[PDB]
Amino acid sequence: ADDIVLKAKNGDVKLPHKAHQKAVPDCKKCHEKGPGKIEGFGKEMAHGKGCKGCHEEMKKGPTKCGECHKK
Numbered sequence: 001a002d003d004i005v006l007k008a009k010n011g012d013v014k015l016p017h018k019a020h021q022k023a024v025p026d027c028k029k030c031h032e033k034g035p036g037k038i039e040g041f042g043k044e045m046a047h048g049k050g051c052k053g054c055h056e057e058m059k060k061g062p063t064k065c066g067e068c069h070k071k
């Protein structure tokens, strides 16, 4: 499903793409060059300007280790 499970032996990080596709009608802040693969993103990113950045910037998403990584 939309859910785009990433890689992380520390606990997959189910990213409600769909939900995120609704909460962030602007498929740009997440998609640079455009909708699809992203060049630059990674781990640190998610832990910052990528997933958390918005989470900590917006204060809606998960912003804790036990708020993303869920075995």
Ligand code: HEM
Residues within 6 Å of the ligand: 004, 006, 017, 020, 021, 022, 024, 025, 026, 027, 028, 029, 030, 031, 035, 036, 037, 038, 041
């Ligand atoms: C907004 C409605 C929106 C669309 C449309 C969209 C499309 C899209 C595509 C086509 C892909 C590639 C997968 C494929 O080729 O089938 C993709 C992948 C990712 N997206 Fe996205 N996306 C939309 C919105 C958003 C938003 C708002 C975010 C972030 C909050 C986001 C994130 C991602 C991520 C991450 C991926 C895969 C890259 C990865 O790191 O694994 N999308 N999306």
Ligand code: HEM
Residues within 6 Å of the ligand: 013, 014, 015, 016, 019, 020, 023, 024, 029, 030, 046, 050, 051, 052, 054, 055, 058, 060, 061, 062, 067, 068
């Ligand atoms: C980056 C790949 C990324 C991940 C991973 C991620 C995860 C995530 C989860 C698991 C939730 C929980 C919400 C739920 O009920 O499923 C969540 C919530 C929100 N996030 Fe997020 N998120 C990633 C990226 C981004 C980015 C880049 C933004 C903003 C640009 C963003 C925002 C939000 C919002 C908003 C929510 C909560 C919904 C709302 O209050 O509207 N996420 N995220």
Ligand code: HEM
Residues within 6 Å of the ligand: 006, 007, 008, 009, 010, 013, 041, 042, 043, 046, 047, 051, 052, 055, 062, 063, 064, 065, 066, 067, 068, 069
């Ligand atoms: C909290 C401070 C926190 C820690 C610590 C942490 C650790 C961590 C590790 C060690 C990895 C690498 C995976 C491995 O070792 O195999 C990793 C990767 C990702 N994480 Fe994380 N993580 C912490 C918090 C968060 C939060 C709150 C989120 C979601 C907003 C998150 C997400 C991710 C993602 C995504 C990855 C992998 C990168 C990718 O491209 O998917 N982390 N984290």
